[PDB]
Amino acid sequence: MPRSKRSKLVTLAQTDKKGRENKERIFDEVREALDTYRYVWVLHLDDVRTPVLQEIRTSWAGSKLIMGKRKVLQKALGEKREEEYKENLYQLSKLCSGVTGLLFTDEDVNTVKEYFKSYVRSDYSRPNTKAPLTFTIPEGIVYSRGGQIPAEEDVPMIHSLEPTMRNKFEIPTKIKAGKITIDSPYLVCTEGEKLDVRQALILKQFGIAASEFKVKVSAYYDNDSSTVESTNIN
Amino acid sequence: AHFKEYQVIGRRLPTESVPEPKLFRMRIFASNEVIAKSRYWYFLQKLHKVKKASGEIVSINQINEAHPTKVKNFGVWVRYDSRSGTHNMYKEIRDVSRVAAVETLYQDMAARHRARFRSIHILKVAEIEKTADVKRQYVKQFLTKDLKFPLPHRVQKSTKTFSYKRPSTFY
Amino acid sequence: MKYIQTEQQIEVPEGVTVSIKSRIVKVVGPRGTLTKNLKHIDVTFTKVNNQLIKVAVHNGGRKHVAALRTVKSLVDNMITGVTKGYKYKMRYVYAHFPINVNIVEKDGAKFIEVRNFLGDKKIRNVPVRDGVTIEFSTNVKDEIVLSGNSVEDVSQNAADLQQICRVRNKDIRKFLDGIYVSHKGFITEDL
Amino acid sequence: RYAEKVSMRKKIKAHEQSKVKDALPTYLLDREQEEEMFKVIKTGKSRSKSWKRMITKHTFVGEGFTRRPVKMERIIRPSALRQKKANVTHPELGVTVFLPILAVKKNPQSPMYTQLGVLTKGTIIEVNVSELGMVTAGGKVVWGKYAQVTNEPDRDGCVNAVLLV
RNA sequence: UUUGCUCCACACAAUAUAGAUGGAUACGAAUAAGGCGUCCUUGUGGCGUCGCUGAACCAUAGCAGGCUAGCAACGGUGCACUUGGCGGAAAGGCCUUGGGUGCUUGCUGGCGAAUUGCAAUGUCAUUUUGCGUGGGGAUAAAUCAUUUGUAUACGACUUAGA
RNA sequence: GCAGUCAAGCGUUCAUAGCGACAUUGCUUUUUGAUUCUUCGAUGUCGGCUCUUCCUAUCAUACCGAAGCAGAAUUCGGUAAGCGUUGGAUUGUUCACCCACUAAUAGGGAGUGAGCUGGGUUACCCUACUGAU
RNA sequence: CUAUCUAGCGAAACCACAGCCAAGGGGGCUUGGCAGAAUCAGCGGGGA
RNA sequence: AAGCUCGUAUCAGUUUUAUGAGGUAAAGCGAAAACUUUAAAUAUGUAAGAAGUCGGACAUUUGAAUGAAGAGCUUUUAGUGGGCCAUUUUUGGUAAGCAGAACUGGCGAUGCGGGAUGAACCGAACGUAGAGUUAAGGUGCCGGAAUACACGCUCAUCAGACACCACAAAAGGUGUUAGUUCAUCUAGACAGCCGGACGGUGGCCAUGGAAGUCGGAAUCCGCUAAGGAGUGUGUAACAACUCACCGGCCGAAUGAACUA
RNA sequence: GGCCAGCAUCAGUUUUGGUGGCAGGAUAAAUCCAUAGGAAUGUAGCUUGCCUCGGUAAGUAUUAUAGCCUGUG
């Protein structure tokens, strides 16, 4: 399609592309990790936060928590029984379906399986999920929290964001003087319904981490046993 | 005109203390003999220090094709001096014979580049046995399984000026 | 590069039916029917079975095949416009002068009548096309809703309507008033 | 469109450049750097009293002209086409300074245009140097140098001259 | 009307032919579609079939087309009538009723042709006009002159005039 | 303009053998909204009134876009030439003018080599046209 | 008053042919647009 | 035009061979292209024979091709004395046009076919006639000839039918076809939708306010799959959002630059 | 015994068709016969899924219940 193409936007940004060098680098690095460490944990983490991961890593430096692209992690693990760094790894290469994410430890199993049940944070809806609260927005001045705190101390929402509210969020938002107002109350959602993406975004815009965060795990392997373990704990 | 492929060798003349030089060979496309010869001398004067007067021709042989009706994928490396500096090109054909492929090439170069026979050079023909190392696509789509396609809007070429029928194509 | 055969798929659901003689279409479903001529476009249609229909071109230039993808999306828009039906929502905002907006029927004409625009005396009528219905918003201030099957009719009517209040010779940054679209949804809600 | 394009080409170039990684004295400091080529023009009522020729080209005239009377004169030097000044550039430091002519020693294609003072290309010229004020051996002051003109005065009334150095 | 105009009959004359010499043989819309037939639930339906040239369909033997005999059929065709419709885009034709009148190569007989002399366009069609022949039909306006004056260079134009 | 700065490329090689685009620095007759009777010796012709018609590159008029365009008014820019584009005073060198009005008082061709201004070197044949038989 | 028309008288200048237009051809030929007998009065734009 | 020697002979706007008054060095090997060292080409001269060869000796295969057996000596006569264009070479140059020479060909005295028409173009040996075949140019109709066959590209909101390099001209253009060189990839390319896109850090002056983005200059390390002393919207700052960068769903080839 | 024409057979010139016999090339190349080997846009057959219960999907499989390519003769 030689002409009448799209022009892709050119910039002068600083960061450059990785390519296959980092891919094969991380591949051989996990293969270095394999014989070094002893306890192996496959981690499904769909909603992830950079400070949470850094918090976990600076919690456990004797551990190593690695994330990267899926199929190369499957590659470095070995997908067949025929090709694998060590044995009894293809079967657990099958199950690791989600956003994974992996850990190399030498510590106890018990401490970690109770750790990640003890470890819980507050995060957002991340839709195709539930959010354990409903929100009616009152027919008054709108605020950054959306009716959470008393009306004296909440700050009204900025007049920049309102056309986004009219366009994305489907909501009638009418502008008296410099704060923002509405004319009817707006319920965003209910309990027990899978939250939509606009619903997730409005609770994001309010800045409400109303959803619990806890990581689940599916399985565990030990090198010295050279055996696979299956554990669904959330 | 309608083309042929020829085999030529030149045996540049015996001089004393260098008799029988090295029998430089070419495969050359043209419609007839003497045109073929002249192109051998033209390429040869380009490629090394010869003149026709200092050279002589061994034989002319029409190269027939071994298995003509085998459908073949050909790929041709060529040069041409168009108005600019000279430049290279590769093209790919599904066709029956080497000679017919270059026929189609000469006309297509004439279309798309206003390219003359005189200022074309062939480097080389090659034939591709295995599929899927052809670089181009417009031949590649003619290689699929269970292939069917139509002749839409077929029109019939009458001699008469009148028709009484309100014609149609079909479909 | 003179692609030899190009093709797309369109998905008929269980409820809706479609009748295609030569390049004419009728599409019938629960909300109703529509029709469309496509004689200007020079393609081929084929059923395989009854949940999927194939459009196609042979010996396509770029223009021909870009038209193919277009015609698919047009027919899909009709399909949506029967099974869901389309629904376009506007608001009519003023700083000083409230619009008086009304619906009238002149010999069956279904004109849409606006007054008090910017303190004018002028009446402006806008026609309504066939196949589209109006409603002023109940229990929502300063809002009007349109619904129909023909998406093209709906959008053309509302685009006309905001094209009427193109206030002229005056600084748009000040005269924020006008009649505009809130959003483009379907009728249903649920599905 | 060509201009904005080339500027965006400079932008990518300078981005990549970022991404990959004069012995003068003091008082000169603080400066910013016949049967042909003749039409017989018959004048009067009875067109036999031609007697006349016209200069249609630039010339420097000197300070004192003492213009001769009307009846004895043959050649007509008009008033406007009289350059006292010319831009002289310096080859070193490329500085353009707008300075006067003092004289014209050399004019190509004739010895007549030398004395007339035509300022065409090839004409070497006696140029003042007063504001530059170089100190030479002995501590003298320079008043005249040689310059070579580099542009036709007819096509532009500016007169660019390279100072012979 | 020394019977002038006109409708129709046949005798001859001229008079020419931008060029007959079996037939201008009727749907429309589309062509990345249709037609024809059939069936149904009558629709953008199904089912079969067709195009791929009019290189066809119709018409077509008789002395340039005769005289006659029949057989089979009550069908076809021509002529002049006559009933009733249809069509206004420049219709100026197309249907259709009745009978009369012939011919019928649907099939079998009989007579003739010659000599235009081995071929010579071998003439057969239509446009126009006039004279004659004999049965009908109907009986004008315009102009000039005059005069007017809404018009008027003279013409022209517009008015009146038994 | 000329001398530079990058050099995209070119020179089959050389970048300073050599070309070299777009940009950009260099003063260019008085740097602080201080400011020259530069229309002064050109013997050279060019300067002017009614009427057609054309072009548009629009001065207004119509519609539009952008402009800090609050409005009114106004500047730029687009389509567009259907229509329209005033009345006076003026010469030893008017030079480019002032006066006012007007919505505005835009620009050029084919024009009088037939009437007029300077310090000044057979229109009787036919043609077409307009009227007329 | 002529111009105009009529009754009568009655020239000259000038004249290769004569004439419809645009583009082209470094009045007529080429290509095109139209042209319907014969003509009157004004016309001043042209006239090897 | 006339004689007289004859067609013995004569020569020829010609090739071949040999040769200079000179190298173009396109060959540097012939001193570390330095070097006349000479592949040649740029063409005049000369000749290819009794007019010759070493007093005396030697005839036409008696000294290359090719063509014309019409040429030569002396005498005598009519008309005529300038010029535009093109090409080749080469000097001077100009913004550019070009100016000057030398050779050659056309026109001039000359018609015909085609070029729509025509001083310069293309073809072409002029008695009258017939028949045939063709040149240059052309074949939709005017107009005699294929609405031939066939591969491709083109669709202009005033294309082109051009003679061509040639002047606007180097380039613009999200029209279009074919190429070249590079890059990516089922160990998941491109489009997209979803998440992250961090901490020291609100880095230094700078300010009323400057928190990655009023703005000057700096370019760090930390964890890192990846996340800049920080593209762009942004509020008075802050905040929020977006890329550039990774990663999840999809599964398929795609993209930068350049030429034509 | 003048004018116009026609038919046949002959000659010169010439246009346009039919048809036969020969020579050459790589003593055509090819097709075609046999033979060996190879591979897929993988034919039979085998495995799994759907199931509209036979068509896909992915594997298998080098002729089998199709065939192809190449080499030699």
UniProtKB/Swiss-Prot annotation, chain A:
Molecular function per GO: large ribosomal subunit rRNA binding
Record-level GO cellular component terms: cytoplasm; nucleolus; nucleoplasm; nucleus; preribosome, large subunit precursor; small-subunit processome
Consequence of changing G68D: Bypasses the requirement for phosphatase YVH1 for the release of MRT4
Disulfide bonds: none
Keywords on record: Cytoplasm, Nucleus, Ribosome biogenesis
Matches recorded under InterPro entries: Mrt4 (IPR033867), Ribosomal_uL10 (IPR001790), Ribosomal_uL10-like_insert (IPR040637), Ribosomal_uL10-like_insert_sf (IPR043164), Ribosomal_uL10-like_sf (IPR043141), Ribosome_Assembly_uL10 (IPR051742)
Example of a GO biological process term: ribosomal large subunit assembly
SUPFAM superfamilies, A to Z: Ribosomal protein L10-like (SSF160369)
Pfam families on file: Ribosomal_L10, RL10P_insert
Localization per Swiss-Prot or TrEMBL: Nucleus, Nucleolus; Cytoplasm
Predominant subcellular localization, coarse grouping: nucleus
Family affiliation: Belongs to the universal ribosomal protein uL10 family.
Subunit structure, interactors included: Associates with the pre-60S ribosomal particle.
Role, per record: Component of the ribosome assembly machinery. Nuclear paralog of the ribosomal protein P0, it binds pre-60S subunits at an early stage of assembly in the nucleolus, and is replaced by P0 in cytoplasmic pre-60S subunits and mature 80S ribosomes.
Protein name, UniProt field: Ribosome assembly factor MRT4
From Swiss-Prot, chain B:
Intracellular or extracellular location(s): Cytoplasm
Gene Ontology cellular-component terms listed: cytosol; cytosolic large ribosomal subunit
Pfam families from the UniProt entry: Ribosomal_L18A
Domain of life: Eukaryota
Keyword Ubl conjugation tagged: yes
Crosslinked positions (Glycyl lysine isopeptide (Lys-Gly) (interchain with G-Cter in ubiquitin)): K124, K130, K148
Residue list for modification Phosphoserine: S31
One function term, GO molecular function aspect: structural constituent of ribosome
Annotated keywords: Cytoplasm, Isopeptide bond, Phosphoprotein, Ribonucleoprotein, Ribosomal protein, Ubl conjugation
Note: Present with 54300 molecules/cell in log phase SD medium.
Summary of subunit composition and partner proteins: Component of the large ribosomal subunit (LSU). Mature yeast ribosomes consist of a small (40S) and a large (60S) subunit. The 40S small subunit contains 1 molecule of ribosomal RNA (18S rRNA) and 33 different proteins (encoded by 57 genes). The large 60S subunit contains 3 rRNA molecules (25S, 5.8S and 5S rRNA) and 46 different proteins (encoded by 81 genes). eL20 forms multiple interactions with RNA and proteins in the central protuberance, connecting components of core functional centers that are located far apart.
Family: Belongs to the eukaryotic ribosomal protein eL20 family.
PANTHER family: 60S RIBOSOMAL PROTEIN L18A
Record-given protein name: Large ribosomal subunit protein eL20A
Curated annotation (Swiss-Prot), chain C:
Subcellular locations according to the entry: Cytoplasm
Superkingdom of source: Eukaryota
GO-annotated biological processes: cytoplasmic translation
Gene Ontology cellular-component annotations: cytosol; cytosolic large ribosomal subunit
GO MF annotations, alphabetized: rRNA binding; structural constituent of ribosome
Record-linked InterPro entries: Ribosomal_uL6-like, Ribosomal_uL6-like_a/b-dom_sf, Ribosomal_uL6_a/b-dom, Ribosomal_uL6_CS2
Pfam families: Ribosomal_L6
Keywords: Cytoplasm, Ribonucleoprotein, Ribosomal protein
Record carries keyword Cytoplasm: yes
PANTHER family given in the database record: 60S RIBOSOMAL PROTEIN L9 (PTHR11655:SF16), 60S/50S RIBOSOMAL PROTEIN L6/L9 (PTHR11655)
Family as reported in the entry's similarity comment: Belongs to the universal ribosomal protein uL6 family.
Main function: Component of the ribosome, a large ribonucleoprotein complex responsible for the synthesis of proteins in the cell. The small ribosomal subunit (SSU) binds messenger RNAs (mRNAs) and translates the encoded message by selecting cognate aminoacyl-transfer RNA (tRNA) molecules. The large subunit (LSU) contains the ribosomal catalytic site termed the peptidyl transferase center (PTC), which catalyzes the formation of peptide bonds, thereby polymerizing the amino acids delivered by tRNAs into a polypeptide chain.
Other notes: Present with 52400 molecules/cell in log phase SD medium.
Protein's recorded name: Large ribosomal subunit protein uL6A
Protein's organism: Saccharomyces cerevisiae (strain ATCC 204508 / S288c) (Baker's yeast)
Upper taxonomic lineage: Eukaryota, Fungi, Dikarya, Ascomycota, Saccharomycotina
From Swiss-Prot, chain D:
Motif (Nuclear localization signal 2): 1-5
Domain of life of the organism encoding this protein: Eukaryota
Native organism taxonomy: Eukaryota, Fungi, Dikarya, Ascomycota, Saccharomycotina
Job of this protein: Involved in the biogenesis of the 60S ribosomal subunit. May play a part in the quality control of pre-60S particles. Under normal, rapid growth conditions, high levels of NSA2 would allow the progression of pre-60S particles through the ITS2 processing.
Subunit text: Component of the pre-66S ribosomal particle. Interacts with NOP7 and RRP1. Interacts with RSA4 (via WD repeats).
Organism: Saccharomyces cerevisiae (strain YJM789) (Baker's yeast)
Compartment(s) of residence: Nucleus, Nucleolus
Renumbered residue ranges of the record's region Disordered: 8-24
GO terms classed as biological process: rRNA processing
Chief site of localization: nucleus
A GO CC term assigned to this protein in UniProt: ribonucleoprotein complex
Keyword Repressor: no
Protein name per UniProt: Ribosome biogenesis protein NSA2
Keyword line: Nucleus, Ribonucleoprotein, Ribosome biogenesis, rRNA processing
Protein family per UniProt: Belongs to the eukaryotic ribosomal protein eS8 family. Ribosome biogenesis protein NSA2 subfamily.
Transmembrane segments: none
Region of the whole protein represented: 54 to 261 of 261
Presence of keyword Repeat: no
